[PDB]
Amino acid sequence: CSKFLNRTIGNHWNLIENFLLNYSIRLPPNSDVVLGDYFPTVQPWFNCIRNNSLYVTMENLKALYWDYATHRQRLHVVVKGKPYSITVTTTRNFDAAAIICICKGSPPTTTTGNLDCNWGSDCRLNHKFPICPSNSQNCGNMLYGLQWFTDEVVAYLHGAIYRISFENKWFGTVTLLWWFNPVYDVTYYRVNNKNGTTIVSNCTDQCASYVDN
Ligand SMILES: *[C@@H]1O[C@H](CO)[C@@H](O[C@@H]2O[C@H](CO)[C@@H](O)[C@H](O)[C@H]2NC(C)=O)[C@H](O)[C@H]1NC(C)=O
Ligand SMILES: *[C@@H]1O[C@H](CO)[C@@H](O)[C@H](O)[C@H]1NC(C)=O
Ligand SMILES: *[C@@H]1O[C@H](CO)[C@@H](O)[C@H](O)[C@H]1NC(C)=O
Ligand SMILES: *[C@@H]1O[C@H](CO)[C@@H](O)[C@H](O)[C@H]1NC(C)=O
């Protein structure tokens, strides 16, 4: 299928807020800043659910985010590039340690098995992790995703960031209960850390005119 079930984040916007709350931890104790990145957005959320030889494709994107709805089966995500590709494979054991690999070879478009990493060589990342935080089902209360930059890949998992550095040419091509949010451009948010509690707000109109480049 192709990009079936087009919905906004709606009442689940708090997932985006939480993402920004974790992202902004690195800021100084006394600052008011506007952060711009390929942040998860609010409009293009998809649930393409229209045989294990079929898959969904996407093109020309720079970051990919997804969420877990709350029958539970499996997810397969491939980000193409050269010499390295990124593959994420999940398994039905939500309370035990999905796998993420960054390697050299040719990932499959579909997977029938589980938790392996033999599609390539000279790997930089080979990491096993639980699908649900703290092995509980506390699941579907945060976003997961990838941002692929030429210099490094940053993986967002369980509120934590994993940064894997290596030179790579990335392609915008991506091959895929789970909801997805393709990200194509930069979104700006204002973060106020003066109060003692960080406050995250949208920057879309008059302030946007001062930061949007
Ligand atoms: C940032 O803008 C989005 C809209 O693009 C706001 O999202 C709305 O949030 C309310 C309350 O959660 C929902 O009822 C609406 O359905 C949302 N509309 C959407 C998703 O388009 C969001 O609340 C704004 N955030 C801030 C801090 O202003
Ligand atoms: C999803 O809806 C938006 C409007 O909110 C539209 O611009 C976009 O092209 C739609 N995408 C698909 C695959 O229907
Ligand atoms: C991420 O933010 C959430 C929501 O604010 C918070 O509960 C959690 O402790 C944070 N996790 C971190 C610091 O990685
Ligand atoms: C954050 O601001 C609100 C008012 O909008 C205030 O009630 C709250 O106590 C402040 N947080 C802290 C840690 O002071």
PDB file of C-alpha atoms and ligand atoms in Angstrom:
ATOM      1  CA  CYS A   1       0.000   0.000   0.000  1.00  0.00           C
ATOM      2  CA  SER A   2       0.979   3.686  -0.170  1.00  0.00           C
ATOM      3  CA  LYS A   3       0.416   6.264   2.601  1.00  0.00           C
ATOM      4  CA  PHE A   4      -3.088   5.087   3.569  1.00  0.00           C
ATOM      5  CA  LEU A   5      -5.051   6.694   6.442  1.00  0.00           C
ATOM      6  CA  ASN A   6      -3.975  10.366   6.559  1.00  0.00           C
ATOM      7  CA  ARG A   7      -4.645  11.897  10.040  1.00  0.00           C
ATOM      8  CA  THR A   8      -3.273  14.658  12.279  1.00  0.00           C
ATOM      9  CA  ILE A   9      -1.705  14.047  15.703  1.00  0.00           C
ATOM     10  CA  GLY A  10      -4.764  15.648  17.306  1.00  0.00           C
ATOM     11  CA  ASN A  11      -5.139  14.966  21.028  1.00  0.00           C
ATOM     12  CA  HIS A  12      -1.888  13.013  21.022  1.00  0.00           C
ATOM     13  CA  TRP A  13       0.167  16.209  20.585  1.00  0.00           C
ATOM     14  CA  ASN A  14       1.583  15.612  24.071  1.00  0.00           C
ATOM     15  CA  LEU A  15       3.888  13.030  22.450  1.00  0.00           C
ATOM     16  CA  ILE A  16       5.546  15.865  20.539  1.00  0.00           C
ATOM     17  CA  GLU A  17       5.705  17.972  23.673  1.00  0.00           C
ATOM     18  CA  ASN A  18       7.457  15.157  25.534  1.00  0.00           C
ATOM     19  CA  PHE A  19       9.921  14.812  22.670  1.00  0.00           C
ATOM     20  CA  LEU A  20      10.835  18.497  23.020  1.00  0.00           C
ATOM     21  CA  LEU A  21      11.072  18.163  26.820  1.00  0.00           C
ATOM     22  CA  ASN A  22      13.800  15.472  26.412  1.00  0.00           C
ATOM     23  CA  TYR A  23      15.511  17.256  23.446  1.00  0.00           C
ATOM     24  CA  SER A  24      15.871  20.525  25.398  1.00  0.00           C
ATOM     25  CA  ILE A  25      17.561  18.916  28.450  1.00  0.00           C
ATOM     26  CA  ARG A  26      20.955  20.013  27.084  1.00  0.00           C
ATOM     27  CA  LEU A  27      20.092  23.736  27.420  1.00  0.00           C
ATOM     28  CA  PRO A  28      21.580  26.134  30.078  1.00  0.00           C
ATOM     29  CA  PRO A  29      19.652  26.739  33.376  1.00  0.00           C
ATOM     30  CA  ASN A  30      18.858  30.314  32.388  1.00  0.00           C
ATOM     31  CA  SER A  31      17.888  30.568  28.742  1.00  0.00           C
ATOM     32  CA  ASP A  32      15.106  31.362  26.280  1.00  0.00           C
ATOM     33  CA  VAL A  33      15.788  29.842  22.903  1.00  0.00           C
ATOM     34  CA  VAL A  34      14.170  28.820  19.668  1.00  0.00           C
ATOM     35  CA  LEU A  35      15.096  25.342  18.556  1.00  0.00           C
ATOM     36  CA  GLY A  36      14.947  24.319  14.918  1.00  0.00           C
ATOM     37  CA  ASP A  37      15.294  20.731  13.731  1.00  0.00           C
ATOM     38  CA  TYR A  38      13.555  17.980  11.796  1.00  0.00           C
ATOM     39  CA  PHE A  39      11.148  17.556  14.697  1.00  0.00           C
ATOM     40  CA  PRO A  40       8.101  15.267  14.534  1.00  0.00           C
ATOM     41  CA  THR A  41       5.218  17.276  13.165  1.00  0.00           C
ATOM     42  CA  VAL A  42       1.467  17.350  13.521  1.00  0.00           C
ATOM     43  CA  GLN A  43      -0.114  16.909  10.085  1.00  0.00           C
ATOM     44  CA  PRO A  44       1.190  13.877   8.014  1.00  0.00           C
ATOM     45  CA  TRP A  45       0.515  10.896  10.290  1.00  0.00           C
ATOM     46  CA  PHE A  46      -0.152   7.607   8.512  1.00  0.00           C
ATOM     47  CA  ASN A  47      -1.444   4.122   9.223  1.00  0.00           C
ATOM     48  CA  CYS A  48      -1.010   2.084   6.013  1.00  0.00           C
ATOM     49  CA  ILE A  49      -2.748  -1.237   6.705  1.00  0.00           C
ATOM     50  CA  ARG A  50      -4.263  -2.150   3.340  1.00  0.00           C
ATOM     51  CA  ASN A  51       0.944 -11.833   2.607  1.00  0.00           C
ATOM     52  CA  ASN A  52       4.453 -10.759   3.832  1.00  0.00           C
ATOM     53  CA  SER A  53       5.887  -9.843   0.413  1.00  0.00           C
ATOM     54  CA  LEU A  54       4.381  -6.340   0.340  1.00  0.00           C
ATOM     55  CA  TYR A  55       5.791  -3.103   1.737  1.00  0.00           C
ATOM     56  CA  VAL A  56       5.295   0.669   1.875  1.00  0.00           C
ATOM     57  CA  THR A  57       7.779   3.107   0.376  1.00  0.00           C
ATOM     58  CA  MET A  58       8.536   6.784   0.953  1.00  0.00           C
ATOM     59  CA  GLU A  59      10.889   9.192  -0.808  1.00  0.00           C
ATOM     60  CA  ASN A  60      12.867  12.408  -0.210  1.00  0.00           C
ATOM     61  CA  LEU A  61      12.612  12.565   3.598  1.00  0.00           C
ATOM     62  CA  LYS A  62      15.263  13.561   6.163  1.00  0.00           C
ATOM     63  CA  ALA A  63      13.865  12.166   9.396  1.00  0.00           C
ATOM     64  CA  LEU A  64      11.307   9.558  10.358  1.00  0.00           C
ATOM     65  CA  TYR A  65       9.235   9.289  13.511  1.00  0.00           C
ATOM     66  CA  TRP A  66       6.725   6.725  14.668  1.00  0.00           C
ATOM     67  CA  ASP A  67       4.370   5.780  17.474  1.00  0.00           C
ATOM     68  CA  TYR A  68       2.781   2.710  19.013  1.00  0.00           C
ATOM     69  CA  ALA A  69      -1.007   2.654  19.235  1.00  0.00           C
ATOM     70  CA  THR A  70      -2.603   2.222  22.700  1.00  0.00           C
ATOM     71  CA  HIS A  71      -3.538  -7.693  17.333  1.00  0.00           C
ATOM     72  CA  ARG A  72       0.140  -6.681  17.867  1.00  0.00           C
ATOM     73  CA  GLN A  73       2.461  -8.070  15.178  1.00  0.00           C
ATOM     74  CA  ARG A  74       5.741  -6.728  13.667  1.00  0.00           C
ATOM     75  CA  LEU A  75       7.391  -3.621  12.191  1.00  0.00           C
ATOM     76  CA  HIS A  76      10.271  -3.377   9.668  1.00  0.00           C
ATOM     77  CA  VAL A  77      11.995  -0.041   8.867  1.00  0.00           C
ATOM     78  CA  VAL A  78      14.806   0.506   6.350  1.00  0.00           C
ATOM     79  CA  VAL A  79      16.637   3.754   5.596  1.00  0.00           C
ATOM     80  CA  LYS A  80      18.776   3.487   2.478  1.00  0.00           C
ATOM     81  CA  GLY A  81      22.208   4.992   1.835  1.00  0.00           C
ATOM     82  CA  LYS A  82      25.772   4.235   0.774  1.00  0.00           C
ATOM     83  CA  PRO A  83      27.944   2.572   2.049  1.00  0.00           C
ATOM     84  CA  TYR A  84      25.731   2.279   5.172  1.00  0.00           C
ATOM     85  CA  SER A  85      22.041   1.493   5.634  1.00  0.00           C
ATOM     86  CA  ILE A  86      19.897   1.577   8.813  1.00  0.00           C
ATOM     87  CA  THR A  87      17.539  -1.293   9.646  1.00  0.00           C
ATOM     88  CA  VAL A  88      15.107  -1.552  12.562  1.00  0.00           C
ATOM     89  CA  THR A  89      13.272  -4.831  13.170  1.00  0.00           C
ATOM     90  CA  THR A  90      10.740  -5.412  15.936  1.00  0.00           C
ATOM     91  CA  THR A  91       9.502  -8.646  17.517  1.00  0.00           C
ATOM     92  CA  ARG A  92       6.250  -9.622  19.275  1.00  0.00           C
ATOM     93  CA  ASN A  93       8.076  -9.833  22.627  1.00  0.00           C
ATOM     94  CA  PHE A  94       7.279  -6.255  23.683  1.00  0.00           C
ATOM     95  CA  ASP A  95       8.602  -6.800  27.206  1.00  0.00           C
ATOM     96  CA  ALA A  96      12.017  -8.136  26.140  1.00  0.00           C
ATOM     97  CA  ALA A  97      15.070  -7.116  24.021  1.00  0.00           C
ATOM     98  CA  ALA A  98      13.642  -5.175  18.747  1.00  0.00           C
ATOM     99  CA  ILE A  99      17.050  -4.675  17.042  1.00  0.00           C
ATOM    100  CA  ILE A 100      18.658  -1.715  15.304  1.00  0.00           C
ATOM    101  CA  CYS A 101      21.663  -2.193  12.960  1.00  0.00           C
ATOM    102  CA  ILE A 102      23.821   0.171  10.943  1.00  0.00           C
ATOM    103  CA  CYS A 103      25.937  -1.887   8.481  1.00  0.00           C
ATOM    104  CA  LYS A 104      27.196  -2.443   4.917  1.00  0.00           C
ATOM    105  CA  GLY A 105      25.230  -4.716   2.491  1.00  0.00           C
ATOM    106  CA  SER A 106      21.569  -4.633   1.218  1.00  0.00           C
ATOM    107  CA  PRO A 107      18.684  -4.830   3.754  1.00  0.00           C
ATOM    108  CA  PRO A 108      15.562  -6.812   2.747  1.00  0.00           C
ATOM    109  CA  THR A 109      12.317  -4.973   2.031  1.00  0.00           C
ATOM    110  CA  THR A 110      10.373  -7.503   4.116  1.00  0.00           C
ATOM    111  CA  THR A 111      11.312  -9.685   7.096  1.00  0.00           C
ATOM    112  CA  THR A 112       9.900 -13.088   8.048  1.00  0.00           C
ATOM    113  CA  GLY A 113      12.327 -13.919  10.887  1.00  0.00           C
ATOM    114  CA  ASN A 114      13.295 -11.830  13.915  1.00  0.00           C
ATOM    115  CA  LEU A 115      16.061 -10.058  15.885  1.00  0.00           C
ATOM    116  CA  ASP A 116      18.897 -10.826  13.474  1.00  0.00           C
ATOM    117  CA  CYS A 117      21.669  -8.708  11.854  1.00  0.00           C
ATOM    118  CA  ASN A 118      23.260 -10.632   8.942  1.00  0.00           C
ATOM    119  CA  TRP A 119      22.339  -8.493   5.930  1.00  0.00           C
ATOM    120  CA  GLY A 120      25.698  -6.698   5.838  1.00  0.00           C
ATOM    121  CA  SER A 121      29.200  -6.291   7.274  1.00  0.00           C
ATOM    122  CA  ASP A 122      31.484  -3.779   9.024  1.00  0.00           C
ATOM    123  CA  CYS A 123      28.684  -2.674  11.402  1.00  0.00           C
ATOM    124  CA  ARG A 124      28.843   0.481  13.503  1.00  0.00           C
ATOM    125  CA  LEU A 125      25.699  -0.229  15.482  1.00  0.00           C
ATOM    126  CA  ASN A 126      24.222  -3.542  16.592  1.00  0.00           C
ATOM    127  CA  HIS A 127      21.860  -2.895  19.470  1.00  0.00           C
ATOM    128  CA  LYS A 128      19.113  -4.945  21.082  1.00  0.00           C
ATOM    129  CA  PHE A 129      16.380  -3.142  22.995  1.00  0.00           C
ATOM    130  CA  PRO A 130      12.811  -3.724  24.324  1.00  0.00           C
ATOM    131  CA  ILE A 131       9.943  -2.238  22.388  1.00  0.00           C
ATOM    132  CA  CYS A 132       8.131  -0.960  25.523  1.00  0.00           C
ATOM    133  CA  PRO A 133      10.008   1.165  28.152  1.00  0.00           C
ATOM    134  CA  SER A 134      11.050  -0.693  31.312  1.00  0.00           C
ATOM    135  CA  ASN A 135       9.567  -3.883  29.835  1.00  0.00           C
ATOM    136  CA  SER A 136       6.074  -2.768  30.883  1.00  0.00           C
ATOM    137  CA  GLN A 137       2.664  -2.817  29.086  1.00  0.00           C
ATOM    138  CA  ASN A 138       4.187   2.015  30.196  1.00  0.00           C
ATOM    139  CA  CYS A 139       4.118   1.794  26.391  1.00  0.00           C
ATOM    140  CA  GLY A 140       2.957   4.145  23.611  1.00  0.00           C
ATOM    141  CA  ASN A 141       3.639   7.208  25.786  1.00  0.00           C
ATOM    142  CA  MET A 142       6.556   8.545  23.712  1.00  0.00           C
ATOM    143  CA  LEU A 143       7.882   8.743  20.159  1.00  0.00           C
ATOM    144  CA  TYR A 144      10.632   6.754  18.492  1.00  0.00           C
ATOM    145  CA  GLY A 145      12.572   7.882  15.456  1.00  0.00           C
ATOM    146  CA  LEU A 146      15.676   8.518  13.386  1.00  0.00           C
ATOM    147  CA  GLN A 147      17.432  11.580  11.982  1.00  0.00           C
ATOM    148  CA  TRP A 148      20.041  10.782   9.358  1.00  0.00           C
ATOM    149  CA  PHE A 149      22.738  13.382   8.787  1.00  0.00           C
ATOM    150  CA  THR A 150      25.869  13.006   6.667  1.00  0.00           C
ATOM    151  CA  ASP A 151      28.102  13.266   9.745  1.00  0.00           C
ATOM    152  CA  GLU A 152      26.014  11.203  12.201  1.00  0.00           C
ATOM    153  CA  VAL A 153      22.826   9.267  12.904  1.00  0.00           C
ATOM    154  CA  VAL A 154      20.801  10.040  15.993  1.00  0.00           C
ATOM    155  CA  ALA A 155      18.329   7.461  17.200  1.00  0.00           C
ATOM    156  CA  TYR A 156      15.568   8.425  19.594  1.00  0.00           C
ATOM    157  CA  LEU A 157      14.581   5.531  21.842  1.00  0.00           C
ATOM    158  CA  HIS A 158      12.818   5.474  25.216  1.00  0.00           C
ATOM    159  CA  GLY A 159      13.453   9.220  25.661  1.00  0.00           C
ATOM    160  CA  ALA A 160      17.218   8.751  25.188  1.00  0.00           C
ATOM    161  CA  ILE A 161      19.419   9.723  22.275  1.00  0.00           C
ATOM    162  CA  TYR A 162      22.005   7.445  20.745  1.00  0.00           C
ATOM    163  CA  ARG A 163      24.489   9.156  18.452  1.00  0.00           C
ATOM    164  CA  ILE A 164      26.456   7.060  15.986  1.00  0.00           C
ATOM    165  CA  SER A 165      29.123   8.980  14.048  1.00  0.00           C
ATOM    166  CA  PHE A 166      30.291   7.975  10.556  1.00  0.00           C
ATOM    167  CA  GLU A 167      30.535   9.560   7.099  1.00  0.00           C
ATOM    168  CA  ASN A 168      27.714   8.397   4.826  1.00  0.00           C
ATOM    169  CA  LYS A 169      25.725   9.435   1.778  1.00  0.00           C
ATOM    170  CA  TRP A 170      22.080   9.125   2.710  1.00  0.00           C
ATOM    171  CA  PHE A 171      19.252   8.519   0.310  1.00  0.00           C
ATOM    172  CA  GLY A 172      15.808   9.942   0.985  1.00  0.00           C
ATOM    173  CA  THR A 173      14.283   6.524   0.297  1.00  0.00           C
ATOM    174  CA  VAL A 174      12.625   4.649   3.141  1.00  0.00           C
ATOM    175  CA  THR A 175      10.973   1.220   3.136  1.00  0.00           C
ATOM    176  CA  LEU A 176       8.427   0.145   5.828  1.00  0.00           C
ATOM    177  CA  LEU A 177      -0.640  -0.741  15.319  1.00  0.00           C
ATOM    178  CA  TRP A 178       2.310   1.450  14.294  1.00  0.00           C
ATOM    179  CA  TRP A 179       1.810   5.052  13.130  1.00  0.00           C
ATOM    180  CA  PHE A 180       4.341   6.957  10.996  1.00  0.00           C
ATOM    181  CA  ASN A 181       5.326  10.596  10.520  1.00  0.00           C
ATOM    182  CA  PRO A 182       7.709  11.425   7.620  1.00  0.00           C
ATOM    183  CA  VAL A 183       9.653  14.641   8.186  1.00  0.00           C
ATOM    184  CA  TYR A 184      10.813  16.779   5.274  1.00  0.00           C
ATOM    185  CA  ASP A 185      11.711  20.149   6.791  1.00  0.00           C
ATOM    186  CA  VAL A 186      12.595  22.220   9.858  1.00  0.00           C
ATOM    187  CA  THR A 187      10.052  23.169  12.525  1.00  0.00           C
ATOM    188  CA  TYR A 188      10.646  25.790  15.199  1.00  0.00           C
ATOM    189  CA  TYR A 189       9.708  25.659  18.896  1.00  0.00           C
ATOM    190  CA  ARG A 190      10.334  28.158  21.675  1.00  0.00           C
ATOM    191  CA  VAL A 191      11.737  26.839  24.932  1.00  0.00           C
ATOM    192  CA  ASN A 192      11.556  28.896  28.139  1.00  0.00           C
ATOM    193  CA  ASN A 193      13.681  27.530  30.986  1.00  0.00           C
ATOM    194  CA  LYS A 194      13.384  30.563  33.336  1.00  0.00           C
ATOM    195  CA  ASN A 195      10.312  29.313  35.325  1.00  0.00           C
ATOM    196  CA  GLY A 196      12.181  26.244  36.771  1.00  0.00           C
ATOM    197  CA  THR A 197      10.079  23.973  34.589  1.00  0.00           C
ATOM    198  CA  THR A 198      10.792  24.099  30.894  1.00  0.00           C
ATOM    199  CA  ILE A 199       7.881  25.402  28.843  1.00  0.00           C
ATOM    200  CA  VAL A 200       7.592  24.421  25.196  1.00  0.00           C
ATOM    201  CA  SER A 201       5.488  26.450  22.793  1.00  0.00           C
ATOM    202  CA  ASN A 202       4.845  26.753  19.023  1.00  0.00           C
ATOM    203  CA  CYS A 203       6.644  29.462  16.975  1.00  0.00           C
ATOM    204  CA  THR A 204       4.547  29.837  13.819  1.00  0.00           C
ATOM    205  CA  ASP A 205       3.757  33.467  12.924  1.00  0.00           C
ATOM    206  CA  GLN A 206       5.323  36.760  14.060  1.00  0.00           C
ATOM    207  CA  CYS A 207       8.258  35.102  15.916  1.00  0.00           C
ATOM    208  CA  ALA A 208       8.604  32.661  13.025  1.00  0.00           C
ATOM    209  CA  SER A 209       9.411  35.649  10.841  1.00  0.00           C
ATOM    210  CA  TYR A 210      12.518  36.167  12.974  1.00  0.00           C
ATOM    211  CA  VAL A 211      13.825  32.569  13.004  1.00  0.00           C
ATOM    212  CA  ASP A 212      12.598  30.809   9.855  1.00  0.00           C
ATOM    213  CA  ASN A 213      15.559  30.338   7.441  1.00  0.00           C
TER     214      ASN A 213
HETATM  215  C1  LIG B   1       0.788  23.771  18.364  1.00  0.00           C
HETATM  216  O1  LIG B   1      -0.103  23.719  17.215  1.00  0.00           O
HETATM  217  C2  LIG B   1      -0.920  22.499  17.145  1.00  0.00           C
HETATM  218  C3  LIG B   1      -1.743  22.609  15.866  1.00  0.00           C
HETATM  219  O2  LIG B   1      -0.927  22.527  14.704  1.00  0.00           O
HETATM  220  C4  LIG B   1      -1.828  22.377  18.405  1.00  0.00           C
HETATM  221  O3  LIG B   1      -2.491  21.089  18.312  1.00  0.00           O
HETATM  222  C5  LIG B   1      -3.852  21.084  18.759  1.00  0.00           C
HETATM  223  O4  LIG B   1      -3.889  20.747  20.140  1.00  0.00           O
HETATM  224  C6  LIG B   1      -5.203  20.637  20.670  1.00  0.00           C
HETATM  225  C7  LIG B   1      -5.091  20.345  22.158  1.00  0.00           C
HETATM  226  O5  LIG B   1      -4.165  19.272  22.353  1.00  0.00           O
HETATM  227  C8  LIG B   1      -5.958  19.529  19.960  1.00  0.00           C
HETATM  228  O6  LIG B   1      -7.303  19.482  20.444  1.00  0.00           O
HETATM  229  C9  LIG B   1      -5.971  19.790  18.468  1.00  0.00           C
HETATM  230  O7  LIG B   1      -6.559  18.675  17.793  1.00  0.00           O
HETATM  231  C10 LIG B   1      -4.553  19.988  17.968  1.00  0.00           C
HETATM  232  N1  LIG B   1      -4.576  20.322  16.559  1.00  0.00           N
HETATM  233  C11 LIG B   1      -3.714  19.787  15.701  1.00  0.00           C
HETATM  234  C12 LIG B   1      -3.014  18.554  16.176  1.00  0.00           C
HETATM  235  O8  LIG B   1      -3.509  20.260  14.598  1.00  0.00           O
HETATM  236  C13 LIG B   1      -0.913  22.404  19.666  1.00  0.00           C
HETATM  237  O9  LIG B   1      -1.703  22.360  20.865  1.00  0.00           O
HETATM  238  C14 LIG B   1      -0.082  23.716  19.685  1.00  0.00           C
HETATM  239  N2  LIG B   1       0.813  23.699  20.856  1.00  0.00           N
HETATM  240  C15 LIG B   1       1.094  24.803  21.545  1.00  0.00           C
HETATM  241  C16 LIG B   1       2.011  24.723  22.728  1.00  0.00           C
HETATM  242  O10 LIG B   1       0.615  25.899  21.221  1.00  0.00           O
HETATM  243  C1  LIG B   2      -2.469  14.408   3.909  1.00  0.00           C
HETATM  244  O1  LIG B   2      -3.247  15.613   4.199  1.00  0.00           O
HETATM  245  C2  LIG B   2      -2.527  16.869   3.916  1.00  0.00           C
HETATM  246  C3  LIG B   2      -3.446  18.019   4.317  1.00  0.00           C
HETATM  247  O2  LIG B   2      -3.583  18.111   5.730  1.00  0.00           O
HETATM  248  C4  LIG B   2      -2.147  16.924   2.407  1.00  0.00           C
HETATM  249  O3  LIG B   2      -1.412  18.116   2.131  1.00  0.00           O
HETATM  250  C5  LIG B   2      -1.273  15.688   2.061  1.00  0.00           C
HETATM  251  O4  LIG B   2      -0.932  15.709   0.665  1.00  0.00           O
HETATM  252  C6  LIG B   2      -2.077  14.398   2.378  1.00  0.00           C
HETATM  253  N1  LIG B   2      -1.240  13.208   2.092  1.00  0.00           N
HETATM  254  C7  LIG B   2      -1.767  12.077   1.602  1.00  0.00           C
HETATM  255  C8  LIG B   2      -0.899  10.885   1.317  1.00  0.00           C
HETATM  256  O5  LIG B   2      -2.981  11.995   1.370  1.00  0.00           O
HETATM  257  C1  LIG B   3      11.807  12.537  28.979  1.00  0.00           C
HETATM  258  O1  LIG B   3      10.695  13.390  29.224  1.00  0.00           O
HETATM  259  C2  LIG B   3       9.652  12.705  29.901  1.00  0.00           C
HETATM  260  C3  LIG B   3       8.399  13.565  29.913  1.00  0.00           C
HETATM  261  O2  LIG B   3       8.724  14.859  30.425  1.00  0.00           O
HETATM  262  C4  LIG B   3      10.145  12.411  31.301  1.00  0.00           C
HETATM  263  O3  LIG B   3       9.103  11.778  32.049  1.00  0.00           O
HETATM  264  C5  LIG B   3      11.354  11.495  31.220  1.00  0.00           C
HETATM  265  O4  LIG B   3      11.925  11.353  32.524  1.00  0.00           O
HETATM  266  C6  LIG B   3      12.414  12.059  30.288  1.00  0.00           C
HETATM  267  N1  LIG B   3      13.383  11.017  30.040  1.00  0.00           N
HETATM  268  C7  LIG B   3      14.672  11.281  29.876  1.00  0.00           C
HETATM  269  C8  LIG B   3      15.221  12.370  30.746  1.00  0.00           C
HETATM  270  O5  LIG B   3      15.361  10.673  29.078  1.00  0.00           O
HETATM  271  C1  LIG B   4       5.670  27.555  36.030  1.00  0.00           C
HETATM  272  O1  LIG B   4       4.735  28.637  35.749  1.00  0.00           O
HETATM  273  C2  LIG B   4       3.407  28.427  36.364  1.00  0.00           C
HETATM  274  C3  LIG B   4       2.525  29.594  35.940  1.00  0.00           C
HETATM  275  O2  LIG B   4       2.219  29.530  34.553  1.00  0.00           O
HETATM  276  C4  LIG B   4       3.552  28.325  37.913  1.00  0.00           C
HETATM  277  O3  LIG B   4       2.278  28.062  38.502  1.00  0.00           O
HETATM  278  C5  LIG B   4       4.526  27.162  38.262  1.00  0.00           C
HETATM  279  O4  LIG B   4       4.687  27.079  39.687  1.00  0.00           O
HETATM  280  C6  LIG B   4       5.901  27.440  37.591  1.00  0.00           C
HETATM  281  N1  LIG B   4       6.853  26.336  37.824  1.00  0.00           N
HETATM  282  C7  LIG B   4       7.796  26.413  38.766  1.00  0.00           C
HETATM  283  C8  LIG B   4       8.750  25.272  38.958  1.00  0.00           C
HETATM  284  O5  LIG B   4       7.910  27.420  39.478  1.00  0.00           O
END
